[PDB]
Amino acid sequence: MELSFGARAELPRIHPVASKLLRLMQKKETNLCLSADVSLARELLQLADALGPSICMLKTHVDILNDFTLDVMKELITLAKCHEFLIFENRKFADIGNTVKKQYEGGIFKIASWADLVNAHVVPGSGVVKGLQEVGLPLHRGCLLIAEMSSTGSLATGDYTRAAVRMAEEHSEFVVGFISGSRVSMKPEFLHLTPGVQLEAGGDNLGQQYNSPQEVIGKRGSDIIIVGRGIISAADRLEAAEMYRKAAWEAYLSRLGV
Amino acid sequence: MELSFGARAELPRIHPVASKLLRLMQKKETNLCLSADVSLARELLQLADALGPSICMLKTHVDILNDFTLDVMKELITLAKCHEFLIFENRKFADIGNTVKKQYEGGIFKIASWADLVNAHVVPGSGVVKGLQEVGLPLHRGCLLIAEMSSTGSLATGDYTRAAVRMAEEHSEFVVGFISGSRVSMKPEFLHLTPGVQLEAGGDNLGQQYNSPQEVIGKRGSDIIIVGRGIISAADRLEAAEMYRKAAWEAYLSRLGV
Numbered sequence A, B: 001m002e003l004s005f006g007a008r009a010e011l012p013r014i015h016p017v018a019s020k021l022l023r024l025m026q027k028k029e030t031n032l033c034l035s036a037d038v039s040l041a042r043e044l045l046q047l048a049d050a051l052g053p054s055i056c057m058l059k060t061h062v063d064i065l066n067d068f069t070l071d072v073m074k075e076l077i078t079l080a081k082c083h084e085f086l087i088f089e090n091r092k093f094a095d096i097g098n099t100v101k102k103q104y105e106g107g108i109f110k111i112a113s114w115a116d117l118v119n120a121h122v123v124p125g126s127g128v129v130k131g132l133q134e135v136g137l138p139l140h141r142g143c144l145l146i147a148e149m150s151s152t153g154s155l156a157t158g159d160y161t162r163a164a165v166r167m168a169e170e171h172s173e174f175v176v177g178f179i180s181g182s183r184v185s186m187k188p189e190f191l192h193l194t195p196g197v198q199l200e201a202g203g204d205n206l207g208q209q210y211n212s213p214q215e216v217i218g219k220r221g222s223d224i225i226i227v228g229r230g231i232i233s234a235a236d237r238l239e240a241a242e243m244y245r246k247a248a249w250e251a252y253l254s255r256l257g258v
Ligand SMILES: O=C(O)c1cc(=O)[nH]c(=O)n1[C@@H]1O[C@H](COP(=O)(O)O)[C@@H](O)[C@H]1O
Pocket: A035, A037, A090, A119, A148, A149, A150, A151, A179, A195, A196, A197, A208, A226, A227, A228, A229, A230, B095, B096, B099
């Protein structure tokens, strides 16, 4: 009784941000999130415009954007609205609740003003979520909890992962899902986003480990692949994005069955 | 055979940043780190100038500084040099190694250019440290690993804490110690910095829990207290800093004994 993305978008307990995401995933036949860790606004915008039709989501890295301004983010929003994708900021919110709220709302970046989605580590306990929610729930935002990590020696295993799932399911007005390597919640209202994805086997020199779209979506039951270097380092980024999109989409269809 | 801060500064395996810190702690009779989560550069600078003599370290929050510029940090460095304290940025580095290095070096904040110390969560595995080190070791910097957290529901316990200690002791060319609630390493070359500290019992509304300087330094064996609201919210911040300094310093002396 596994439901399509379009049907999950209508579930009673679905979060509005998750519903918007699931609907556009179904409409566009894409479950690909591009991770755009680029230092130049022009490259970010040119990637978002050219690859926008191929992605359901753009993971931004504003901490590395040398020429960040809030106007760059206004232009990115225009592309996200045009092409229909969500903006997910990479910043790892991972402080006590009191401090995280100011990190999310304030400073020069004003992340909550333009990010549809943010992610948090659960290591501080549920106060990290409660603090983020005091800013994000009024701003109609969603959050992902990092329940598992792709890198060698990850401590996000076992009881840590279970605590992330419990924290999500108790803050469902704000938490829309997980960064994980596999399905970790049995509740279909939650999204599963999986980084550490390439078409070819391997890793990097600093602990990254890759699995394929077919493995992560098809066998491990995740919903969305997050891909950085497998696209960003390719010569033709559009073609690369299409290969990842078609891989992740067909893996989803085949797991759904008739 | 517990050694004074000044003797620890001379240990064979001491990191140069730790040695500088330990020497100034001994010289100034201060084991207080002020956490300055303020939104205005003028307030940050006025606090750093007035409280500089009373602290061994200033924990900055540049993600919330509304009027951040690199020149503000140049002025902060001038105060840190004058009054003799280290600058410790709060940003929770907690990504895979490849991504964390750009977060530390780049963007608008260029954290590695002005921060003596940074902190990392160990949840990604040791690649987080290896990535930070590829920027910080050439820049002569130090790192603290978050081995325990002060907040309710913290998952930084048990085997997680042990993994942080192992990661520190295998990256001693760069890791100078821990954010922890107590002594977690038996090796005296490592610093222990403890947040969640107030003179009075209690907590906040978002999971923070407080213990006193006497408890954390004297009974739990930590080296340095990190204090935010207990100073920042007081009317006379200088007096408050002196009360925290005298509390933490005497607790250290009494544990050292004859
Ligand atoms: O924050 C994440 O999405 C993340 C979590 C995790 O466990 N692993 C992981 O690789 N990521 C991110 O996903 C991206 C992966 O990049 P590539 O290895 O270049 O595809 C980077 O932005 C990482 O920060």
